[PDB]
Amino acid sequence: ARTGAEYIEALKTRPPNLWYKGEKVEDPTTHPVFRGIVRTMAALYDLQHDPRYREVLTYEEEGKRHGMSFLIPKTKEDLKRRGQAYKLWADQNLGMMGRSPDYLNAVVMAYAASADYFGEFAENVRNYYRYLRDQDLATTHALTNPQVNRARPPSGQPDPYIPVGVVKQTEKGIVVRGARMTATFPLADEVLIFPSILLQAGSEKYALAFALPTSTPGLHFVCREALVGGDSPFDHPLSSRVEEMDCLVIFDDVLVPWERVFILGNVELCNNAYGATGALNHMAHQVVALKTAKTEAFLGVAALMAEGIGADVYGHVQEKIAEIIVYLEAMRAFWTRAEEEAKENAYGLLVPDRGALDGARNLYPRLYPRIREILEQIGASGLITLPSEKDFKGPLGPFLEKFLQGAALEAKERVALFRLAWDMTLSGFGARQELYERFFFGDPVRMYQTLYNVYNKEPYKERIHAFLKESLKVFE
Amino acid sequence: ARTGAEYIEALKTRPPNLWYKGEKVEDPTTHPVFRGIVRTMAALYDLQHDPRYREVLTYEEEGKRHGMSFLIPKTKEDLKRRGQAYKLWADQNLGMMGRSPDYLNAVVMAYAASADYFGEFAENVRNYYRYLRDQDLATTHALTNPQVNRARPPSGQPDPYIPVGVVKQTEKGIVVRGARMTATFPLADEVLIFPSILLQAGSEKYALAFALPTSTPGLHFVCREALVGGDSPFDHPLSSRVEEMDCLVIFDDVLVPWERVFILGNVELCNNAYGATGALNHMAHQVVALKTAKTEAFLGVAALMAEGIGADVYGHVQEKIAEIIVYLEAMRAFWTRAEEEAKENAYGLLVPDRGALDGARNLYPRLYPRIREILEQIGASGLITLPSEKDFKGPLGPFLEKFLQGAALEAKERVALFRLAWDMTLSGFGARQELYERFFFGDPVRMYQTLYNVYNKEPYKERIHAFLKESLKVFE
Amino acid sequence: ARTGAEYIEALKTRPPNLWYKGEKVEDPTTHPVFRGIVRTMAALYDLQHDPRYREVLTYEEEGKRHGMSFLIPKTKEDLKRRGQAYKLWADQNLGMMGRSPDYLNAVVMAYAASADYFGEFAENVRNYYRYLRDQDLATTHALTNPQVNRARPPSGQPDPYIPVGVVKQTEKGIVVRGARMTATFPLADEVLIFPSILLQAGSEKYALAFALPTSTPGLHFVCREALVGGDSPFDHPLSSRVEEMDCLVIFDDVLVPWERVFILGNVELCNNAYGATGALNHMAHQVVALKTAKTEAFLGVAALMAEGIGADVYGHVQEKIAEIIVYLEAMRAFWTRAEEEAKENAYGLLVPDRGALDGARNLYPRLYPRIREILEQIGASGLITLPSEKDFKGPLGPFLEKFLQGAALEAKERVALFRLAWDMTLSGFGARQELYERFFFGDPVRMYQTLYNVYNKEPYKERIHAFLKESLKVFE
Amino acid sequence: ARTGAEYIEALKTRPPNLWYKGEKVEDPTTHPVFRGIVRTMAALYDLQHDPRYREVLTYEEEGKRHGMSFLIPKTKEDLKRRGQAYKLWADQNLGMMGRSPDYLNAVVMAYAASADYFGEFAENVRNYYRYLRDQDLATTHALTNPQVNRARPPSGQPDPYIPVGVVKQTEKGIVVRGARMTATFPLADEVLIFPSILLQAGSEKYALAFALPTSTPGLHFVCREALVGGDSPFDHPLSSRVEEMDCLVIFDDVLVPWERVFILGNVELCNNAYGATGALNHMAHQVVALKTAKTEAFLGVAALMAEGIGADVYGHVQEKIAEIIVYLEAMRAFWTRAEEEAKENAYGLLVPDRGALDGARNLYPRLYPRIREILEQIGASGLITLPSEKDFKGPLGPFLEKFLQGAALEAKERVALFRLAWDMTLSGFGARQELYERFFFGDPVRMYQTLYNVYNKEPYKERIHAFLKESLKVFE
Ligand SMILES: Cc1cc2nc3c(=O)[nH]c(=O)nc-3n(C[C@H](O)[C@H](O)[C@H](O)COP(=O)(O)OP(=O)(O)OC[C@H]3O[C@@H](n4cnc5c(N)ncnc54)[C@H](O)[C@@H]3O)c2cc1C
Ligand SMILES: Cc1cc2nc3c(=O)[nH]c(=O)nc-3n(C[C@H](O)[C@H](O)[C@H](O)COP(=O)(O)OP(=O)(O)OC[C@H]3O[C@@H](n4cnc5c(N)ncnc54)[C@H](O)[C@@H]3O)c2cc1C
Ligand SMILES: O=C(O)Cc1ccc(O)cc1
Ligand SMILES: O=C(O)Cc1ccc(O)cc1
Ligand SMILES: O=C(O)Cc1ccc(O)cc1
């Protein structure tokens, strides 16, 4: 298990090929746009060494201690252990960090346990898993093709190499060129270029699955407008430390070593990779724990805002808070059933229930916008009446302490709270979180169509046919 | 455990004091408006004797066999057994019977296990429980006051005795007069006049809890407009057999024997009766199983309708069906967590988790109208193109077999299906189901306000305060 | 202009070929299922002769007086006159009659004014218009094909003649066979078999537009389950008089005289018939007035229910009523703009603004379910506590007058009101109204796709391009 | 009529008492946080002198030319002229500037026309109007009290002077102390401290209405966190120029000259000021035109995004765009009816219809969040894949031109468009717009309660009573 210092030193020494506003980022650990999230990930690693959480976040195996997200679960108890680690890490950042590495470790763990799925590339998968685990490396990923002409398939874009495709194969590996649309949290040592979870690969030229060091020559991470509001924790409680960053990933004829190839030119293998291996089940397990943590944070903030300005005495405000409670319980319920109904898949890997997780990941994208709306409706103008810590420290400080106090709440505490509520919903950072929840796991339109097609609807249809037998009997 | 014949004979011999359109109902077992539901309840009782389900629906105890809903659960396994019985009974009627007796048996069971709660009336409660259990009697209940002037409390209505109040107490018992607004499924041997689950009793004169035989002199059940569409199972697949009926309950100076009194003049005891005893937990347990069954029925019908007319090829139709699947999984999740997180209450009674059940009973009233809407959006005009079995048997039968066939579906089967979908949503019977789901457990406005007030929000608020410490540190 | 007596005599003498539950309906004017709506339509005709409304409902022209819905408007004032007639008729039945004849007269009127559109069949159209106008006949229509396999076009169903198609052409006319899915209000002298408003005709064999007497040999109207709750106006205030009935229309090799043919084998003419002639504009004009009347009825009922039980003192109840007010004003606004922005089309016919009417007919289907929901949320259990007038007239009458009185409202008046609210929303009749509002003008999915394609979006796109010029200038 | 140069010189010479992060803003015309919006307002003033729009934006009167928003309308044509000016100004900034001065000029104009309402202060009002008009000054306003303890009235806060209250009265005027919660667009010469539009004044000490120069000693404007993303029009198309800023307004014992007092200590006059004078009608008129402009901008962007990435070929995407079209038409309809149904009030001032405007201002806050959602659902990941103009100008420029091109759309144009869509919805600037639309005119909860109470519901209730006469007749 890595310490924060080791993670920071690793990035400083071999930084990912990041670009920000036309220039290469030489040191993300000190760059104003990235130092915040780097410190945050480092803190997650350090927590693994805190005696209070060591048993929760890591496990011992043959003299070594590994991060819990690498544990191949053999029992429901192990599944619960993975869940508790997901939750503890998520709580550190109020569920605002959506791409912490344990999400992808769940994917790699499942791929490794179900390695036979990959055929001749099975050993590469097992070895890669052990590599990430032993060195406790941080990962980022990109599974989608550039949004250019969505009316056409990957092979029907303006250029055959807009999506990442194989240019040629050599004795050393494969050369790829193209791009992936989005990779969140590029402050990692490795990047996973895996298949889409719900979309079809289309052509063999694009049916790929491989991993590379983020410093690989020819690999570029083009960052979008930064959403770090500032460094003050009072003024920007969240964006100052949890801005993971999103970027376009470019492959300028990048060489991928054969040992890092997991799938090559096999459309079928790409299309069922997550479902067959159980990666889908485990990555969704991390998500349900994460969204439970996020919902708990919103509940706390909503309750405090309402109490803070005396709005909690109004029935409709109480109802809005109760609504968040209902959603919180719904997520806890999915989480519980996912673990309690777990069964082994075709490769003997115990996986959390897909029914419960499909329910959670398809329901939360609908609940989140409403949870966000509730905070807006409760806070109202208090959400934009945001003086700075500098205003409190300035000449008008005394006036602010009078006009911005709340009901039995000091002004500084009140503004600190509303600054947080604002950063969770209305700052550029907060607003992005909404778009993230709506789409990170896929386009809801196609996720729902996928659920329809894969779900076994026969038992329910059969019960109706049986019930209708009495109806048709009138003609006998 | 009762057989259907015993239930039917009991009603015929000592029928409840029912009134329909100005006249007393002499024999509900043969009356056109009630014979359907009577036969349905009888069938539920008979199922208890089917060898295939005997072990699911009943339990043996000291030479006797009792209905599962009377079982005082000692372990989570027992809780699961109660749940499986709720589900099996619910499935028989596609979850359309909302007031089957096992719901109230759950209440009485909990009251009995937590009998110490009732003080001097504890033995009356225990004895009543044993009575209902041993004779396997059917119950109905009414907990709300007449909807007259909702702007005023029970003691502020046009008359002190609009709500049920104590007139006087004698050596034989108490005399009560007033009325209860609604009692569903009056085809029972007993009626439970218990306190409101979420509303305050208000005055001692109304703080009551007692049970009476439905034939008690002075007790009247005034039925509303019947929703039985007819007797043909083809034309009215559900209303012909599952119309439970709703009625106003009148108490014309009714004498309640002391042995049938459970709470008298104690506002506090009335206000916490369901929560303290665990009745709330267990009755909600029956509800979650019931709504899971209901959602399964809608899923089957929606899937069959879409497939039947070839609408399943359209993405948005697939999405609507997937939406029902998400809701189904949500209910299954609440159900699972309710049992898995069960703990004993203050009286040593194991009760399913309130968090999960409060989530289920406060979420489903919001989901149901949408599930109903989905069926309407899928069926469209097919939902009102409802010829009768008589039309198929008539001269135009051949034409109907051509114009009303579906995609690889015969016309009679198609119409049988749409007649069912219509009866589940648009017939008077179907439409009532929507109002029922919206309100049976209470007014959502006050249920949400209640949830807000009773839920422990402190842990979430505390986490936010801890997170904000860094914000306030800028002033140090 | 016809009188009610003339309409009733016409139906009695030459009744439409109606079938109900396997038998031919010999006299709809006395049949229990149809006498109610027949009396209602008759009353609409009689209103044309009431001196108070004669000038509103009819116009004089060359010694004759015709129904206002036949008036070819030359000015905005004439358009307003047509609107006021639509409204007055709609108000008589609280906007519950969705297929009153003035809706179709608007269609025929527009077809006649724009008759050149129909080419060689132009005179047939003009003559038909004059026929309907002079004799003030009642019409019904059916524009959709049987719902069999929606995954296939009209020419791809299990049989080439499931949809209405031309079998052959002779010296006397054309012979057609097939069926139309739905025709509401079959108590008419004529039936209009016109093209779909938003769907493509597909094949020439189905590209038809003609009209026939409802008694034409080979023509059959198969009625669905009747929704008449009874004859008591107290018990069934609406279903006893406004149940229009829906039916499947069968064509058993029906001969259509050449003079009654308006479009034959011309897919293009069918696909643009309503838009080019202005029929769409005028029929939607009747609809907006009708929905304004319907919304006014719901507002009145909601206000009275809330006041009646004292629920109007609660903020959320006030908000729900205000919501209906907002929707009412929205419809009034569309109506006003539709008339004020009216312009002449290609044939010189003044037509109300399509933008405003497309807004109204695409928005109301979304608002109605909510308006219905609001009534349910306000009334709660009062909506199913429906004793009969017979109960009030019976032995328990005195008790009911006490327990069902409202806040300063007598019990009989209270129940009369809730019986009405129930009939508007939860009776089989009421529930059907919801499905009707959702679909009568077409499937929302395709109506919205149609609006997208026909609307001129260029001006808005152009404004954005202009705004972005400054953005692209940074590269100069 | 003012020119932009005159406005800029005025602010530079006598700048409002603005504070940003603890320091006084000496020159808002050059300050990085304010220079953008200052230039934008200046451009609005300059447009008044463009020959193409002079007749639209100004009117001549006795040798002088004034801004159209000052015109006291005598006819519906004048009302239309005011509307066209509101629209032209709104279009310049895609409806993103919510507090342009013409909104408040509408208020002052109405106050002046209905000056008799103010009694002894009537001349002060007339004179103030002429002052603002003649010098074409810019105004800002603040009507709400500090959000401290909403469970208590203005007189029940932690201090009697948290809300703005009169300390004393002298020969020169009144001295006030306290604060107003929010004032948007403080880059004005004058600030209007008027009564709340929907809330009660409460106590005479707070029942005030006056105006002051923004540089008045003791008056302070404390600005919130700035939302200007940068100066690049490519990177921040909107926040670089339309960030109006919100601020808390502090009154440190400010002296208000008697000539600037319009209402003093009269609760009744404060509570009906906007309705009686017609200010409510006219300010809402500006709003409906503004929201129509805003909706047109969103329609253009949504259409371009969908077309740009080829998503317009999908039915659901077309439906979402059509949804915006429906909302656009709804707003146009309210606007049209507001002008067409205009009538003179008690003071002879012609005012647009309140019914239509109450509909528009109570409906749009519900429509806007959905319009915003639609853009998010259409753009998906394209909304966060935002490289900078600097990235296009850098080494990877060529790669970006390939991977970020759209369907028949160049990469720079595509990113310029998505940068705009992002700034309209997800940037801190964009997200604030949502909160603004939800609350600027008041809390929806109380706006709806207000609408319920003031609307005349009697006609609808009367129609229902008349309809029910037939129901009650059964007892005769
Ligand atoms: C009470 C009532 C009264 C009516 N009265 C009249 C009347 O008087 N006269 C007359 O002509 N009609 C009448 N109608 C018919 C009405 O106009 C149709 O119901 C409406 O146009 C929808 O078409 P449909 O029912 O055939 O739906 P279908 O097309 O069968 O649709 C069923 C479902 O499949 C989907 N679907 C089907 N095809 C497609 C597609 N290509 N793309 C995407 N989705 C698709 C639909 O969205 C929907 O979810 C009435 C309907 C009702 C419900
Ligand atoms: C971006 C933005 C710009 C604005 N610009 C201006 C401006 O230029 N000038 C100016 O005057 N104002 C402006 N406003 C102020 C705006 O008018 C208010 O936000 C709105 O009137 C709501 O009042 P409030 O914020 O005080 O909410 P609060 O009253 O504090 O409400 C907070 C919450 O408590 C509830 N609540 C509080 N009291 C009650 C009650 N009695 N009954 C039921 N519920 C209650 C509310 O419903 C809500 O959920 C702006 C607001 C925003 C958000
Ligand atoms: O695979 C996809 O098509 C969308 C997606 C992307 C990243 C991820 O983690 C899950 C789903
Ligand atoms: O034409 C259609 O496809 C549907 C429709 C049917 C009847 C009507 O009056 C309007 C639209
Ligand atoms: O007056 C209020 O209570 C809210 C409000 C504030 C500013 C405004 O322009 C309109 C309404």
Closest ligand 1 atom to Cα of C147: 30
Among B233, B464, B471, whose Cβ lies nearest the Cβ of A470?
Answer: B233
Return d(Cα C328, Cα C293) in angstroms, integer. Answer: 9
Residues of C with CB below 8 A from A474's CB? none
User: How much distance in Å is there from the Cα of A143 to the middle of ligand 3?
Assistant: 6
Return d(Cα B82, Cα B69) in angstroms, integer. Answer: 6
Task: Specify which residues B212 forms β-bridges with.
Answer: B191
With CB atoms and an 8 Å threshold, state whether D388 touches A19: no
Return d(Cα B289, Cα B85) in angstroms, integer. Answer: 9
Count, residues in chain A: 476
Provide CATH 2.40.110.10 ranges for chain D. Answer: 138-265
Q: Helical H runs in B18-101?
A: 35-47, 54-57, 76-92
Return d(Cα C282, Cα C276) in angstroms, integer. Answer: 12
Intra-chain end-to-end CA distance of chain B, in Å: 73
DSSP letter, residue C188:
S
CATH T-level assignment (fold) for domain C1-137: 4-hydroxybutyryl-coa dehydratase, domain 1 (1.10.3140)
Alpha-carbon gap: D219 to the closest alpha carbon of chain C (Å):
37
Return d(Cα C261, Cα C124) in angstroms, integer. Answer: 7
Two tokens at D404?
């970020």
Two tokens at C230?
């009874």
Do D90 and D100 meet the contact criterion of CB atoms below 8 Å apart? yes
- Helix (H) and strand (E) counts in chain A: 16, 14
Return d(Cα B115, Cα D244) in angstroms, integer. Answer: 66
Query: How many angstroms separate the Cα of C360 from the Cα of each of A251, D354, D435?
Result: 51, 20, 27
Q: Which of C198, C179, C178, C189 is nearest to C275 (CA)?
A: C198
Two tokens at A408?
């039995």
Position D356, amino acid: A
The answer for D 160-199 residues in CB contact with A (under 8 A) is 162, 178-179, 181-182
Residue with tokens 């790699």: A108
Query: How many angstroms separate the Cα of B50 from the Cα of each of B40, B57, B63, B96, C72?
Result: 15, 9, 19, 22, 73
Two tokens at C102?
């003035």
Do B72 and B110 meet the contact criterion of CB atoms below 8 Å apart? no
Residue A282 — left, alpha, or beta (φ > 0 → left; ψ -120 to 50 → alpha)? alpha
Q: Helical H runs in C75-184?
A: 76-92, 102-113, 122-135
Task: Specify which residues D23 forms β-bridges with.
Answer: D20
Q: What CATH number is given for C138-265 in this structure?
A: 2.40.110.10
CATH T-level assignment (fold) for domain D266-476: Butyryl-CoA Dehydrogenase, subunit A; domain 3 (1.20.140)
Return d(Cα B148, Cα C311) in angstroms, integer. Answer: 10
Collapsed DSSP state (helix, strand, coil) of residue D260: helix
Q: What is the largest CA-CA distance in chain B?
A: 92
Collapsed DSSP state (helix, strand, coil) of residue D83: helix
Do C112 and C125 meet the contact criterion of CB atoms below 8 Å apart? yes
With residue A282 as reference, give the H or E element that holds it: helix A279-308
Residues of A with CB below 8 A from C316's CB? 315-316
Q: Is C391 on the interface with B (CB under 8 A)?
A: yes
Closest ligand 5 atom to Cα of D443: 4
Do B143 and B441 meet the contact criterion of CB atoms below 8 Å apart? no
Do C7 and C138 meet the contact criterion of CB atoms below 8 Å apart? yes
Q: Is A390 on the interface with C (CB under 8 A)?
A: no
C-beta D143 within 6 A of ligand 5? yes
Provide CATH 1.10.3140.10 ranges for chain C. Answer: 1-137
Two tokens at C193?
């078999």
Residues of C with CB below 8 A from D299's CB? 457, 460
- The full DSSP string for A241-255 is T----EEEEEEEEEE
User: How much distance in Å is there from the Cα of A373 to the middle of ligand 2?
Assistant: 15
Return d(Cα C40, Cα C216) in angstroms, integer. Answer: 24
Q: List strand residue ranges (DSSP E) for B282-390, in order.
A: 343-344, 350-351
With CB atoms and an 8 Å threshold, state whether B462 touches A334: no
Two tokens at B166?
């104590």
With CB atoms and an 8 Å threshold, state whether D407 touches A148: yes
With CB atoms and an 8 Å threshold, state whether C332 touches D355: yes
Question: Which residues does ligand 3 sit against, CB inside 6 Å?
Answer: A 143-144, 196-199, 441-442
Two tokens at B436?
């029922």
Closest ligand 4 atom to Cα of C198: 3
CA–CA–CA angle B170, B176, B181 (5° rounding): 165
CA–CA–CA angle A307, A310, A312 (5° rounding): 60
Two tokens at C455?
């609307």
Return d(Cα D121, Cα D194) in angstroms, integer. Answer: 14
Residues of D with CB below 8 A from B316's CB? 315-316
Query: How many angstroms separate the Cα of D25 from the Cα of each of A393, B128, B405, D17?
Result: 16, 79, 77, 7
3-class secondary structure per residue, A82-129: HHHHHHHHHHHCCCCCCCCCHHHHHHHHHHHHCHHHHHHHHHHHHHHH
User: How much distance in Å is there from the Cα of D153 to the middle of ligand 2?
Assistant: 14
DSSP letter, residue C409:
B
Provide CATH 1.20.140.10 ranges for chain C. Answer: 266-476
Residue with tokens 């006219």: D282
Return d(Cα A64, Cα A1) in angstroms, integer. Answer: 8
Return d(Cα C417, Cα C237) in angstroms, integer. Answer: 9
Q: Is D158 on the interface with B (CB under 8 A)?
A: no
Two tokens at C36?
């109610």
Task: Specify which residues B136 forms β-bridges with.
Answer: none
Return d(Cα B377, Cα A190) in angstroms, integer. Answer: 47
Ligand nearest to the CA of C274: 4
Experimental method: X-ray
Ligand nearest to the CA of D200: 5
With CB atoms and an 8 Å threshold, state whether D23 touches A394: yes
User: How much distance in Å is there from the Cα of A202 to the middle of ligand 3?
Assistant: 16
Do B43 and B4 meet the contact criterion of CB atoms below 8 Å apart? yes
Residue with tokens 């016809």: C2
Return d(Cα A212, Cα A199) in angstroms, integer. Answer: 23
Q: Which of C2, C85, C15 is nearest to C45 (CA)?
A: C2
Alpha-carbon gap: B316 to the closest alpha carbon of chain D (Å):
8
Task: Specify which residues B66 forms β-bridges with.
Answer: B59
Return d(Cα C235, Cα A95) in angstroms, integer. Answer: 56
Collapsed DSSP state (helix, strand, coil) of residue C12: helix
With residue A448 as reference, give the H or E element that holds it: helix A444-454
| Residues in Cβ contact with A456 at an 8 Å cutoff, skipping those fewer than 6 apart | none
The answer for B 303-362 residues in CB contact with D (under 8 A) is 315-316
Best residue among D185, D440, D450 to mutate for probing ligand 5, ranked by most atoms within 8 Å of CB: D440
Closest ligand 3 atom to Cα of A198: 3
Q: Is A63 on the interface with B (CB under 8 A)?
A: no
Position B338, amino acid: A
Among A358, A359, A448, whose Cβ lies nearest the Cβ of B319?
Answer: A448
Q: Is D455 on the interface with C (CB under 8 A)?
A: yes
